Motif scaffolding. Structure first.
Motif, PDB file in Angstrom:
ATOM      1  N   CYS A   2       0.813  -1.236   0.000  1.00  0.00           N
ATOM      2  CA  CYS A   2       0.000   0.000   0.000  1.00  0.00           C
ATOM      3  C   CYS A   2       0.846   1.287   0.000  1.00  0.00           C
ATOM      4  CB  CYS A   2      -1.092   0.014   1.083  1.00  0.00           C
ATOM      5  SG  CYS A   2      -0.655  -0.619   2.774  1.00  0.00           S
ATOM      6  N   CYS A   4       1.721   5.016  -0.530  1.00  0.00           N
ATOM      7  CA  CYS A   4       1.080   6.319  -0.380  1.00  0.00           C
ATOM      8  C   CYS A   4       2.009   7.466  -0.623  1.00  0.00           C
ATOM      9  CB  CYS A   4       0.484   6.473   1.006  1.00  0.00           C
ATOM     10  SG  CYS A   4      -0.881   5.387   1.190  1.00  0.00           S
ATOM     11  N   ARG A   6       3.558  11.075   0.190  1.00  0.00           N
ATOM     12  CA  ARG A   6       3.996  11.426   1.523  1.00  0.00           C
ATOM     13  C   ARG A   6       3.555  12.811   1.956  1.00  0.00           C
ATOM     14  NH1 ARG A   6       9.329   7.844   2.055  1.00  0.00           N
ATOM     15  NH2 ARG A   6       8.262   5.886   2.613  1.00  0.00           N
TER      16      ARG A   6
ATOM     17  N   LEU B  81       2.172   8.489  -9.842  1.00  0.00           N
ATOM     18  CA  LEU B  81       3.044   9.529  -9.266  1.00  0.00           C
ATOM     19  C   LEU B  81       4.261   9.724 -10.124  1.00  0.00           C
ATOM     20  CD1 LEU B  81       2.782   9.206  -5.362  1.00  0.00           C
ATOM     21  CD2 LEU B  81       1.543  10.678  -6.862  1.00  0.00           C
ATOM     22  N   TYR B 150       9.785  -2.196  -5.183  1.00  0.00           N
ATOM     23  CA  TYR B 150       8.528  -1.684  -5.717  1.00  0.00           C
ATOM     24  C   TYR B 150       8.270  -2.168  -7.158  1.00  0.00           C
ATOM     25  CZ  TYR B 150       8.607   1.499  -1.663  1.00  0.00           C
ATOM     26  OH  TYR B 150       8.599   2.035  -0.391  1.00  0.00           O
ATOM     27  N   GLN B 153       6.243  -0.250 -10.132  1.00  0.00           N
ATOM     28  CA  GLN B 153       5.850   1.061  -9.608  1.00  0.00           C
ATOM     29  C   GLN B 153       6.912   2.149  -9.846  1.00  0.00           C
ATOM     30  OE1 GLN B 153       4.902  -1.539  -5.967  1.00  0.00           O
ATOM     31  NE2 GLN B 153       3.770   0.360  -5.410  1.00  0.00           N
ATOM     32  N   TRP B 191       6.876   9.277  -2.298  1.00  0.00           N
ATOM     33  CA  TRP B 191       6.040   8.230  -1.750  1.00  0.00           C
ATOM     34  C   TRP B 191       6.868   7.042  -1.305  1.00  0.00           C
ATOM     35  CZ3 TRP B 191       5.665   3.328  -4.164  1.00  0.00           C
ATOM     36  CH2 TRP B 191       6.216   3.231  -5.436  1.00  0.00           C
ATOM     37  N   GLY B 192       6.166   6.039  -0.791  1.00  0.00           N
ATOM     38  CA  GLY B 192       6.751   4.798  -0.343  1.00  0.00           C
ATOM     39  C   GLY B 192       5.639   3.986   0.284  1.00  0.00           C
ATOM     40  N   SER B 193       5.919   2.718   0.553  1.00  0.00           N
ATOM     41  CA  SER B 193       4.995   1.863   1.269  1.00  0.00           C
ATOM     42  C   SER B 193       5.242   2.047   2.756  1.00  0.00           C
ATOM     43  CB  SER B 193       5.232   0.418   0.887  1.00  0.00           C
ATOM     44  OG  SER B 193       4.052  -0.315   1.070  1.00  0.00           O
ATOM     45  N   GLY B 194       4.266   2.649   3.438  1.00  0.00           N
ATOM     46  CA  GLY B 194       4.444   3.103   4.810  1.00  0.00           C
ATOM     47  C   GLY B 194       5.692   3.957   4.925  1.00  0.00           C
ATOM     48  N   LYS B 200      11.118  -1.392   1.875  1.00  0.00           N
ATOM     49  CA  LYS B 200      10.230  -0.397   1.314  1.00  0.00           C
ATOM     50  C   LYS B 200      10.874   0.989   1.508  1.00  0.00           C
ATOM     51  CE  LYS B 200       7.674  -3.552   0.078  1.00  0.00           C
ATOM     52  NZ  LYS B 200       6.830  -3.822  -1.095  1.00  0.00           N
ATOM     53  N   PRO B 201      11.905   1.297   0.694  1.00  0.00           N
ATOM     54  CA  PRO B 201      12.567   2.594   0.864  1.00  0.00           C
ATOM     55  C   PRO B 201      11.688   3.729   0.381  1.00  0.00           C
ATOM     56  CG  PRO B 201      13.521   1.385  -0.984  1.00  0.00           C
ATOM     57  CD  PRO B 201      12.493   0.489  -0.388  1.00  0.00           C
ATOM     58  N   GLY B 202      12.082   4.963   0.662  1.00  0.00           N
ATOM     59  CA  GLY B 202      11.365   6.128   0.155  1.00  0.00           C
ATOM     60  C   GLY B 202      11.571   6.191  -1.341  1.00  0.00           C
TER      61      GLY B 202
END
Ligand SMILES: [Ca+2]
Lengths: 46, 221
Positions: A2, A4, A6, B81, B150, B153, B191-194, B200-202
Motif C-alpha cells: 500500500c 502512499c 507522503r 506519481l 517496488y 511502480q 512516496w513509499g509503502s508506509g 520499502k525505501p522512500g
C-alpha cells in the motif's frame, strides 16, 4: 502497495484514529480494517 | 522523517513548508521566486513558508508568502506519481540569506549520500510530527533494488533513497521536500509503502530529468 504519497492531509478514521492522509487510511483499511471509513477531514477527537 | 535527527535552524535554508492552514508538504527554494515540490502536493491557495525551523512557533523572522502560481508537471500522473513535480511561484520574491538549492546538471548515481529533510512523521509505528525540521542522511539506492522493492511502480523519473533494512526514511508530511546530494537537488519526497519499513525505501522524484522543464517553466512564467 500500500504505496502512499507522503503528503500530510490528516483525516479521521471510523476507528477514531487520525490517519496522516486518505491514502494511509486506505492502507489500514486494506491491511486489517475492512469496515474502516473516513468519518471527516482533520484529526479525530481523542 | 523517521530515524533522522534535528537539522538545526537555518541548516537547510532551501527547505520550505507548504501551508494551507497547516503544514502539509515540503518544498525546495530553487531561486527567490520559485519552489519545487511534489505535484501531489498541489493545492489551491498555498502559502509557502520560508526560513522555518520550528513550524509550530513563529520565531518572527520567517517569510510566509502565498503561491502565485502552482504549476504541476503536465505529465504528472496522480495514479502512478510519475512526474511528481510541481513548480510553485512566490507572490513576491523571498528575502535571501533562506537560500536556494542548486539544480542538478547530472543525475546522481546509486551510493550517493543525500540529505533529506522535512516536518513529516518521525515514527513508523505511531505518529510523531516534529516541530523543528528533521534531517536524514541516506544514500540513493540502486535502480534494480528500488524496482525489486517496488515492482512495476518505479519509472525512470523515480529513485529510491534510504535503507532497505528499514528504520530511516521520509514519511507523510515530507512530500515535496528536498533530497540534496553533493550540493544538488536530486530528489523530491514522493512516496513509499508506509515509512521506514524493511524493503520499502522512500521513493523520490528524479529532479535531474526535469531541469530543462523547470528552466522552461521558470523562464516562461
Ligand atoms: Ca517557525
Amino acid at each position: 502497495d500500500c504505496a502512499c504519497p507522503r503528503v500530510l492531509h490528516r483525516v479521521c478514521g471510523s476507528d477514531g484514529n487520525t490517519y496522516s492522509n486518505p491514502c494511509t487510511l486506505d492502507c489500514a483499511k486494506h491491511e486489517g480494517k475492512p469496515d474502516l471509513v473516513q468519518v471527516h477531514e482533520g484529526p479525530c477527537d481523542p | 522523517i523517521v530515524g533522522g535527527y534535528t537539522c538545526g535552524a537555518n541548516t537547510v535554508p532551501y527547505q520550505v513548508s507548504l501551508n494551507s492552514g497547516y503544514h502539509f508538504c515540503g518544498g525546495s527554494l530553487i531561486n527567490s521566486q520559485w519552489v519545487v515540490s511534489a505535484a501531489h502536493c498541489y493545492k489551491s491557495g498555498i502559502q509557502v513558508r520560508l526560513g522555518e525551523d520550528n513550524i509550530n512557533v513563529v520565531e518572527g523572522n520567517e517569510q510566509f508568502i502565498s503561491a502565485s502560481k502552482s504549476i504541476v508537471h503536465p505529465s504528472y500522473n496522480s495514479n502512478t506519481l510519475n512526474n511528481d513535480i510541481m513548480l510553485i511561484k512566490l507572490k513576491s520574491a523571498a528575502s535571501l540569506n533562506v537560500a536556494s538549492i542548486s539544480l542538478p546538471t547530472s543525475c546522481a548515481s546509486a551510493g550517493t549520500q543525500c540529505l533529506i529533510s522535512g516536518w513529516g512523521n518521525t515514527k513508523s509505528s505511531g505518529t510523531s510530527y516534529p516541530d523543528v525540521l528533521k534531517c536524514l542522511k541516506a544514500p540513493i539506492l540502486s535502480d534494480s533494488s528500488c524496482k525489486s522493492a517496488y515492482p512495476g511502480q518505479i519509472t525512470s523519473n523515480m529513485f529510491c533513497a534510504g535503507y532497505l533494512e528499514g528504520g530511516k526514511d521520509s514519511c507523510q508530511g515530507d512530500s515535496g521536500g528536498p533530497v540534496v546530494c553533493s550540493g544538488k537537488l536530486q530528489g523530491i519526497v514522493s512516496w513509499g509503502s508506509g515509512c521506514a519499513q524493511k524493503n520499502k525505501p522512500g521513493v523520490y522524484t528524479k529532479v535531474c530529468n526535469y531541469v530543462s522543464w523547470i528552466k522552461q517553466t521558470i523562464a516562461s512564467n
